[PDB]
Amino acid sequence: DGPEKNYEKTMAILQIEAEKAELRLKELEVRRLMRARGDGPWYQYPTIDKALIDHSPKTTPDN
């Protein structure tokens, strides 16, 4: 096949690779930031649900 075949295929190879590599670097950075700050979807560790608590009046007041 003509040189244009291989060459046109290969810059597409390089573009896909680079658009994956900078994505990998940004993924490392995002994962670190979101493990440290935590203000986002993942790396959010569980907590206590607010539905378990009860607000109805109790036997003794001020509790």
Binding site: T10, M11, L14, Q15, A18, E22
Partner: protein, 173 residues
């Protein structure tokens, strides 16, 4: 002819026109015409056959033409597309340089025997055009490791420009 004197130089031919001082027949001319008659003519007519059958069905080819592309100096860093294109262009220009220095190699090599014991004075200009093709080559392509890249070539050009600017400013203090 297929070639030309401009890129394949050749000194004008000159022969002594032998005029023997003796009456003995000249042998070399006789053996040459004999070798012409029993060797040159049959191969000549065979090639006549070949030339006519070539002309019977002729096909052509063309110079595979390219075009200029953005180079590393104009290539953006991390821009892999123009990066690869400039790499291709620079490598083919490197091959161009190797080929042209090969032509100068053959020019000077053939000139040495062409000009004789006089080669030291007629090929000197040819030698003059060699002592400058090497040095400039060393300026454009030299010491580029074994993974030579258009980026590394640009880095070497960077060395050259900083060195020449340094010399210019140290001359100007």
């Amino acid at each position: 002819d297929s070639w030309d004197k401009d890129v394949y130089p050749e000194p004008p031919r000159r022969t002594p026109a032998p005029a023997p001082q003796t009456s003995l027949p000249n042998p070399v001319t006789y053996l040459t015409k004999i070798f012409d008659l029993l060797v040159d003519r049959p191969v000549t007519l065979a090639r006549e056959f070949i030339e006519q059958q070539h002309a019977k069905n002729r096909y052509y080819y063309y110079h595979r033409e390219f075009r200029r592309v953005p180079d590393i100096t104009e290539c953006e860093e991390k821009d892999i597309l123009c990066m690869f294109e400039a790499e291709m262009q620079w490598r083919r220009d490197y091959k161009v340089d190797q080929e042209i220095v090969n032509i100068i190699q053959e020019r000077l090599k053939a000139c040495q025997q062409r000009e004789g014991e006089s080669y030291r004075q007629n090929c000197a200009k040819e030698l003059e055009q060699f002592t400058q093709v090497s040095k400039a080559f060393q300026d454009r392509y030299s010491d580029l490791g074994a993974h030579y890249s258009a980026r590394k070539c640009l880095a070497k050009q960077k060395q050259r420009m900083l060195a020449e600017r340094k010399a210019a400013k140290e001359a100007a203090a």
